[PDB]
């Protein structure tokens, strides 16, 4: 039974920044469309294991990720490569399948968001 760890870093002000067509698309298209999905809301902030009473969440999940962090990272130009952002979305879905069980409501929500994520990433420019 533990408290929550601090959330992931969202700004790297000592690293150089770039705006690419790919990075604009990940924020204005991928993140935006997923954020407004009917089942997006549990993924918009880190898992609060104390409020939700999940004492084993951060014993099982050592690489947590959520769309609130991804959004703040894109808004702060944290990513230099679009693949770093894609990896974050993948880690987020993967954690949900590691912690939860087949047929759980949260897993069906992750499945619906991942299908939409693949549809949007399919159309990534360049
Ligand atoms: C767990 C888990 N594993 N991966 N993720 C992303 C989660 C995850 C992340 N955030 C929330 C979350 C945030 C706010 C609320 C509030 C407080 C407003 O009621 C409920 C929340 N639940 C629910 C839940 C609670 C406890 C155990 C499992 C599920 C889901 C919600 C969808 O409908 C089913 C219950 C979450 C589950």
CSV table of C-alpha atoms and ligand atoms in Angstrom, one decimal:
chain,number,residue,atom,x,y,z
A,1,UNK,CA,0.0,0.0,0.0
A,2,UNK,CA,1.7,3.1,-1.3
A,3,UNK,CA,1.1,6.8,-2.2
A,4,UNK,CA,1.3,7.8,-5.9
A,5,UNK,CA,4.6,8.5,-7.5
A,6,UNK,CA,5.1,12.0,-9.0
A,7,UNK,CA,3.6,12.3,-12.6
A,8,UNK,CA,5.8,11.9,-15.7
A,9,UNK,CA,8.0,15.0,-16.7
A,10,UNK,CA,6.1,17.2,-19.2
A,11,UNK,CA,8.7,19.8,-20.1
A,12,UNK,CA,12.4,19.6,-21.0
A,13,UNK,CA,13.4,23.4,-21.4
A,14,UNK,CA,17.1,22.5,-21.8
A,15,UNK,CA,16.5,20.5,-25.0
A,16,UNK,CA,16.0,22.1,-28.5
A,17,UNK,CA,12.5,22.4,-30.0
A,18,UNK,CA,11.1,21.8,-33.5
A,19,UNK,CA,7.7,21.9,-35.1
A,20,UNK,CA,7.2,19.3,-37.8
A,21,UNK,CA,4.1,18.4,-39.7
A,22,UNK,CA,4.2,15.0,-37.9
A,23,UNK,CA,4.3,16.7,-34.4
A,24,UNK,CA,1.4,19.2,-35.3
A,25,UNK,CA,-0.7,16.2,-36.5
A,26,UNK,CA,0.0,14.2,-33.2
A,27,UNK,CA,-1.4,17.1,-31.1
A,28,UNK,CA,-4.1,18.7,-33.3
A,29,UNK,CA,-5.3,15.5,-34.8
A,30,UNK,CA,-4.3,12.3,-32.9
A,31,UNK,CA,-4.4,13.6,-29.3
A,32,UNK,CA,-7.4,15.9,-30.0
A,33,UNK,CA,-9.6,13.1,-31.6
A,34,UNK,CA,-8.7,10.6,-28.9
A,35,UNK,CA,-9.3,13.2,-26.1
A,36,UNK,CA,-12.9,13.8,-27.4
A,37,UNK,CA,-13.7,10.0,-27.7
A,38,UNK,CA,-16.7,9.0,-25.4
A,39,UNK,CA,-14.3,6.6,-23.5
A,40,UNK,CA,-11.3,8.9,-23.2
A,41,UNK,CA,-11.9,10.4,-19.7
A,42,UNK,CA,-10.1,7.6,-17.6
A,43,UNK,CA,-7.0,8.1,-19.7
A,44,UNK,CA,-6.9,11.9,-19.5
A,45,UNK,CA,-4.8,12.0,-16.3
A,46,UNK,CA,-2.4,9.6,-14.4
A,47,UNK,CA,-3.9,6.7,-12.5
A,48,UNK,CA,-4.5,8.0,-8.9
A,49,UNK,CA,-4.0,4.7,-7.0
A,50,UNK,CA,-4.9,6.2,-3.6
A,51,UNK,CA,-8.2,7.8,-4.8
A,52,UNK,CA,-9.1,4.7,-6.7
A,53,UNK,CA,-7.7,2.4,-4.0
A,54,UNK,CA,-5.4,0.3,-6.2
A,55,UNK,CA,-2.4,-0.4,-3.8
A,56,UNK,CA,-0.8,-2.8,-6.3
A,57,UNK,CA,-1.0,-0.4,-9.4
A,58,UNK,CA,2.5,1.1,-9.1
A,59,UNK,CA,4.0,-2.2,-8.0
A,60,UNK,CA,2.9,-3.7,-11.4
A,61,UNK,CA,3.1,-0.5,-13.5
A,62,UNK,CA,6.7,0.9,-13.5
A,63,UNK,CA,6.3,3.0,-16.8
A,64,UNK,CA,3.0,4.8,-16.3
A,65,UNK,CA,1.6,7.1,-19.1
A,66,UNK,CA,-1.7,8.9,-19.8
A,67,UNK,CA,-3.1,11.3,-22.4
A,68,UNK,CA,-2.9,14.3,-20.0
A,69,UNK,CA,0.9,13.9,-19.8
A,70,UNK,CA,1.0,13.3,-23.6
A,71,UNK,CA,-1.1,16.5,-24.3
A,72,UNK,CA,1.2,18.6,-22.0
A,73,UNK,CA,4.3,17.0,-23.6
A,74,UNK,CA,3.1,18.0,-27.1
A,75,UNK,CA,2.0,21.4,-25.9
A,76,UNK,CA,5.5,22.0,-24.4
A,77,UNK,CA,7.3,20.6,-27.5
A,78,UNK,CA,8.8,17.8,-25.3
A,79,UNK,CA,9.1,15.4,-28.3
A,80,UNK,CA,11.7,15.9,-31.0
A,81,UNK,CA,10.8,12.7,-32.8
A,82,UNK,CA,7.1,11.7,-33.5
A,83,UNK,CA,8.0,8.1,-32.6
A,84,UNK,CA,8.7,9.1,-29.0
A,85,UNK,CA,5.1,10.3,-28.8
A,86,UNK,CA,3.8,7.2,-30.5
A,87,UNK,CA,5.7,5.1,-28.0
A,88,UNK,CA,3.9,7.0,-25.1
A,89,UNK,CA,0.4,6.2,-26.5
A,90,UNK,CA,1.5,2.6,-26.9
A,91,UNK,CA,2.8,2.4,-23.3
A,92,UNK,CA,-0.5,3.9,-22.1
A,93,UNK,CA,-2.6,1.1,-23.9
A,94,UNK,CA,-0.2,-1.6,-22.9
A,95,UNK,CA,-0.3,-0.7,-19.2
A,96,UNK,CA,-4.1,-1.0,-19.2
A,97,UNK,CA,-3.8,-4.6,-20.5
A,98,UNK,CA,-1.0,-5.5,-18.0
A,99,UNK,CA,-3.0,-4.3,-14.9
A,100,UNK,CA,-6.6,-5.3,-15.9
A,101,UNK,CA,-8.4,-8.4,-17.0
A,102,UNK,CA,-10.1,-9.7,-20.3
A,103,UNK,CA,-13.6,-8.2,-20.4
A,104,UNK,CA,-13.1,-5.4,-17.8
A,105,UNK,CA,-14.9,-2.2,-18.7
A,106,UNK,CA,-11.6,-0.2,-18.7
A,107,UNK,CA,-10.1,-2.8,-21.2
A,108,UNK,CA,-13.0,-2.4,-23.6
A,109,UNK,CA,-12.5,1.4,-23.4
A,110,UNK,CA,-8.7,1.0,-24.1
A,111,UNK,CA,-9.6,-1.2,-27.1
A,112,UNK,CA,-12.0,1.4,-28.6
A,113,UNK,CA,-9.4,4.2,-28.1
A,114,UNK,CA,-6.5,2.1,-29.6
A,115,UNK,CA,-8.6,1.3,-32.7
A,116,UNK,CA,-9.2,5.1,-33.2
A,117,UNK,CA,-5.5,5.8,-32.5
A,118,UNK,CA,-4.5,3.3,-35.3
A,119,UNK,CA,-7.0,4.9,-37.7
A,120,UNK,CA,-5.5,8.3,-37.0
A,121,UNK,CA,-1.8,7.2,-37.0
A,122,UNK,CA,-2.4,5.4,-40.3
A,123,UNK,CA,-2.9,8.9,-41.8
A,124,UNK,CA,0.3,10.5,-40.2
A,125,UNK,CA,1.9,12.8,-42.8
A,126,UNK,CA,5.2,12.3,-44.7
B,1,LIG,C1,-7.6,0.8,-13.4
B,1,LIG,C2,-7.1,1.5,-14.6
B,1,LIG,N1,-6.1,0.8,-15.3
B,1,LIG,N2,-5.8,1.5,-16.4
B,1,LIG,N3,-6.5,2.7,-16.3
B,1,LIG,C3,-6.4,3.7,-17.3
B,1,LIG,C4,-7.3,2.7,-15.2
B,1,LIG,C5,-8.2,3.7,-14.8
B,1,LIG,C6,-7.8,5.1,-14.8
B,1,LIG,N4,-8.5,6.1,-14.4
B,1,LIG,C7,-9.7,5.8,-13.9
B,1,LIG,C8,-10.7,6.7,-13.2
B,1,LIG,C9,-10.7,8.0,-13.0
B,1,LIG,C10,-11.8,8.6,-12.3
B,1,LIG,C11,-12.8,7.8,-11.8
B,1,LIG,C12,-13.9,8.4,-10.9
B,1,LIG,C13,-13.3,8.7,-9.5
B,1,LIG,C14,-14.5,9.7,-11.5
B,1,LIG,O1,-15.0,7.5,-10.7
B,1,LIG,C15,-12.8,6.4,-12.1
B,1,LIG,C16,-11.8,5.9,-12.8
B,1,LIG,N5,-11.5,4.5,-13.2
B,1,LIG,C17,-12.4,3.4,-13.0
B,1,LIG,C18,-11.8,2.3,-12.2
B,1,LIG,C19,-11.7,2.4,-10.8
B,1,LIG,C20,-11.1,1.4,-10.0
B,1,LIG,C21,-10.6,0.3,-10.6
B,1,LIG,C22,-10.7,0.1,-12.0
B,1,LIG,C23,-11.3,1.1,-12.8
B,1,LIG,C24,-13.0,2.9,-14.4
B,1,LIG,C25,-13.5,4.1,-15.2
B,1,LIG,C26,-14.1,3.6,-16.5
B,1,LIG,O2,-15.2,2.6,-16.3
B,1,LIG,C27,-14.7,1.5,-15.5
B,1,LIG,C28,-14.2,1.9,-14.2
B,1,LIG,C29,-10.2,4.5,-13.8
B,1,LIG,C30,-9.5,3.5,-14.3
